[PDB]
Amino acid sequence: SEVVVVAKFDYVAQQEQELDIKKNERLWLLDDSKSWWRVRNSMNKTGFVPSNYVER
Amino acid sequence: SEVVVVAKFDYVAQQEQELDIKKNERLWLLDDSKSWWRVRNSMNKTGFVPSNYVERK
């Protein structure tokens, strides 16, 4: 579900896929049912997948 | 911390920033301390931020 969220802290993005935000900024959370991990595969391609799709 | 994870399910990436994976594939989880939400700002730029950095409004 799409909901509005508020930044608790500043965040300086470390990669182009990330977003710079400031404390108290309001953002659209596009899908509150989705959390993501950044993973890298055996072919050295990197990207995001849903957290519940992988496990230790 | 970096750990190796196993895909529980196939996943077809929906955007260029996501990764296609197959069930039972082993992957590097680059930092298991980071769990990300995809958000969009007032300037209509979209990207990932760590989930503990935002909450409902």
Author numbering:
A (entry chain B): 4 to 59
B (entry chain A): 4 to 60
Please quote the paper that reports this structure.
All of the dimers are swapped in the same manner, but with different juxtapositions of the second SH3.1 domain with respect to the first. The hinge at Lys-36 provides quite a bit of flexibility that allows the dimer to pack in many different crystal lattices. Given the large number of swapped, independent chains present in different crystal forms and grown under different conditions, swapping seems an intrinsic property of this SH3 domain.
During our studies, it became clear that Nck-SH3.1 exhibits conformational diversity and can swap half the number of its residues to form a dimer.
